[PDB]
Design a protein around this ligand. Structure first.
Ligand code: ZN
Ligand code: ZN
Ligand code: ZN
Lengths: 93, 145, 78, 427
């Protein structure tokens, strides 16, 4: 898998989720207790990328959250959690 | 937090499972320990979780990716539940071991404990003495009023 | 070869104060002293304590702690 | 010099047990016992046959009646057998190996000037050394035997002096014993009874190299006892290396075996007819996993099975990940009932539907053998195919089967017994 996190300084944009992966934690893939709202960086929310899914990239229909365990361990305090595809290009998958 | 009355009942099963030939047993048992320790935090089950930490630790010398990834997550949850002091006390053994493998593993564990709760470690570092050339004692903390 | 796990471990090595298997005692203890001084400057009552113990003003204690941050523990070996 | 190991005379009450009574006695003692021809356990000091001098010290103990690990371990050790005791502190295990040690020592010539110890007990810590030493001096007084403790963290020079005065028993930590031996404070030339206590703790504390060095420098026809609170692959491998046909004694609550069938065939090429006559019946029970070591052999077997009309997959180490995942998925979903794999490629095959594992080509070693047959399901069986060129492996396999209380056919035993290193060292 050629997938990393963005991990840039996140700003005031809010992450979205498509309807497949809707109630998951963007970090640990859990469904128990969504706690903290996800912020993304300004580059990952731009132009045609505005409003896409943080996890997969599809059309977003709800807000993305950190679960309670990640909030307790302070995993919301790293960079932008958008998934980046290194094996392909920008307008690719 | 409802699971705080039921850690003692489950500890023997987990002790058997964390000492087992099957790798999936140990991986899943470390997942259990992680979720227990994060679920009870600020309720006082440090005795039970210290007992379980004794059985989690021998698995840090594991070459398998998913197993070592489960063990590290259990250790990070036990950091939150138990305190960085006990984790630092377990970790100070092998930071300067002669064996480069032991040093690798222990510095991984220490770097986790350091990135999480860097400021709490100021109170838990041990006393290291001055040699001929360098001063390593912290004197302000020895001041008495 | 690009995984999330090797990206996490490389970002850990970028956090100042982190070490590896070739870290020396000198480096470890210099990190300890530097964040000890930063924490004394952050916490107000530890600084009150030191300022009463050594009969100095708080601004003077902060300036002294800042000056001691450039080379704590003396110079390195080699 | 020759020495005796077997000092045991089974009590009639124990000889007179029916097979069912024996099974129920071990259940009552909460013990699981394996190995070749284990002695029956006793249940009383009378069954151990101790004389009045030893019983005198035992009655001033701290003991009645014997503990379970003593009940089984004392007859094992008195019989001269090696032993793996999987048991926790302080289940009476220390006395379990100390009492037979005393009897063993008493049979030999007394110490001459220059003689090293007859028995050595190796410990992870000074603390345990001192406890074990205290017990050795207590019980050893029954026969006026001398014990010296040499451990790290203790005076090198006082220990050297005590060793020079002479001792039948040395209790030690591993590195410190080795140090005194190299310094010629003592020597291992009279050691015939060797105990490694808390061997798991010793490995965890970094002592495996020292433990192995000691074992390597003590005469190989010694009696050796190994105790651990846990069994893990590291200690099991150790036991294979430093014990000879041990009886394995496990306290029940600390433990928690695959059905093996071994066939001895004419030659490598005759494995094919063996397999084609049986493979359909095997697939009727569930999925079938065939192991080989070499890619070329995997390929040849798989190609022949395909030509034979079988619906099978192949898994070898040169497969890319997607290639690999397809085969494993097909096997998991039962799209293919049969899979040929090499050892190196077999990750991902802990599949419940596997009811037959076949070791078609012989495993490189017994560790690999164990890893292979672990893939089997219960209702599941692991077949191993040997030929007359596999006699060395056969010896290791016999010992593996015996430790697992599995059947050792006459044919298999005869094959193993072809080699002197097996046929003699054999208990
Ligand atoms: Zn999470
Ligand atoms: Zn971003
Ligand atoms: Zn999505």
């Amino acid at each position: 898998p050629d997938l990393i996190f963005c991990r840039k300084q996140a700003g005031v944009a809010i992450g979205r989720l498509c309807e497949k992966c809707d109630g998951k934690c963007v970090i640990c893939d859990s469904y128990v207790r969504p706690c903290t709202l996800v912020r993304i960086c300004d580059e990952c929310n731009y132009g045609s990328y505005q409003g896409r899914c943080v996890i997969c990239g599809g059309p977003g229909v709800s807000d993305a959250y950190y679960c309670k365990e990640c909030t307790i361990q302070e995993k919301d305090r790293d960079g932008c959690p958008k998934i980046v595809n290194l094996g392909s290009s920008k307008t690719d998958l | 937090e409802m699971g705080k009355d039921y850690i003692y009942a489950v500890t023997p099963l987990l002790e058997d499972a964390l000492m087992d030939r099957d790798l999936v047993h140990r991986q899943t048992a470390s997942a259990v320990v992680q979720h227990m320790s994060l679920g009870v935090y600020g309720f006082g089950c440090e005795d039970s979780l210290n007992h379980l930490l004794n059985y989690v630790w021998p698995n840090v010398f594991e070459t398998s990716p998913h197993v070592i990834q489960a063990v590290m997550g259990a250790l990070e949850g036990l950091r939150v539940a138990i305190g960085p002091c006990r984790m630092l006390q377990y970790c100070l053994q092998g930071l300067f071991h002669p064996a480069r493998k032991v040093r690798d593993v222990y510095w991984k564990i220490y770097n986790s404990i350091y990135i999480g709760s860097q400021d709490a470690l100021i109170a838990h570092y041990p006393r290291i003495y001055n040699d001929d050339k360098n001063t390593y004692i912290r004197y302000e903390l020895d001041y008495i009023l | 070869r690009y995984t999330i796990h090797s990206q996490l471990e490389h970002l850990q090595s970028k956090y100042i104060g982190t070490g590896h298997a070739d870290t020396t005692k000198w480096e470890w203890l210099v990190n300890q002293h530097r964040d000890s001084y930063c924490s004394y400057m952050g916490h107000f009552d530890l600084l009150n304590y030191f300022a009463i113990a050594e009969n100095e003003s708080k601004a003077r204690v902060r300036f002294n702690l800042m000056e001691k941050m450039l080379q704590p523990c003396g110079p390195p070996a080699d | 010099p020759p020495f005796e190991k077997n000092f045991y005379n089974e009590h009639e009450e124990i000889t007179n047990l029916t097979p069912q009574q024996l099974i129920d006695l071990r259940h009552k003692l909460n013990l699981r016992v394996s190995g070749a021809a284990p002695p029956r356990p006793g249940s009383s000091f009378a069954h151990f046959g101790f004389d009045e001098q030893l019983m005198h010290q035992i009655r001033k103990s701290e003991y009645t009646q014997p503990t379970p690990i003593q009940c089984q371990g004392v007859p094992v050790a008195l019989s001269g057998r090696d032993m793996i005791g999987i048991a926790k502190t302080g289940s009476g295990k220390t006395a379990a190996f100390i009492w037979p040690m005393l009897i063993h020592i008493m049979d030999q010539k007394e110490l001459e000037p220059g003689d090293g110890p007859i028995a050595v007990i190796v410990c992870p810590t000074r603390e345990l050394c001192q406890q074990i030493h205290a017990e050795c001096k207590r019980f050893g007084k029954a026969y006026n035997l001398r014990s010296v403790a040499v451990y790290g963290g203790g005076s090198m020079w006082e220990q050297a002096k005590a060793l020079q005065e002479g001792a039948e028993i040395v209790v030690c930590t591993p590195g410190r014993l080795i140090d005194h031996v190299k310094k010629k404070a003592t020597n291992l030339q009279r050691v015939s009874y060797l105990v490694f206590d808390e061997a798991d703790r010793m490995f965890d504390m970094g002592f495996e190299y020292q433990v192995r060095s000691i074992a390597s420098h003590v005469r190989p026809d010694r009696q050796t006892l190994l105790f651990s609170a846990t069994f893990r692959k590291k200690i099991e491998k150790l036991a294979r290396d430093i014990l000879i046909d041990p009886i394995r004694v496990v306290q029940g609550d600390i433990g928690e075996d695959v059905t093996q069938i071994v066939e001895i065939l004419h030659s490598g090429p005759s494995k094919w007819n063996w397999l084609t006559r049986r493979l359909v019946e095997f697939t009727s029970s569930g999925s079938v996993l065939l192991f080989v070591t070499k890619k070329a052999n995997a390929e040849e077997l798989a190609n022949n099975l395909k030509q034979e009309g079988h619906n099978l997959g192949l898994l070898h180490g040169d497969m890319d990940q997607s290639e690999r995942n397809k085969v494993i998925s097909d096997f998991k979903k039962k799209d293919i009932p049969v899979l040929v794999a090499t050892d190196v490629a077999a990750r991902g095959l802990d599949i419940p539907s596997i009811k037959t594992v076949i070791n078609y080509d012989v495993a490189r070693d017994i560790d690999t053998h164990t890893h292979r047959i672990g893939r089997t399901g219960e209702k599941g069986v692991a077949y191993t195919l040997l030929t007359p060129k596999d006699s060395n492996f056969a010896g290791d396999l016999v010992r593996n089967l015996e430790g697992a209380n599995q059947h050792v056919s006459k044919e298999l035993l005869d094959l193993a017994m072809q080699n002197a290193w097996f046929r003699k060292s054999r208990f």
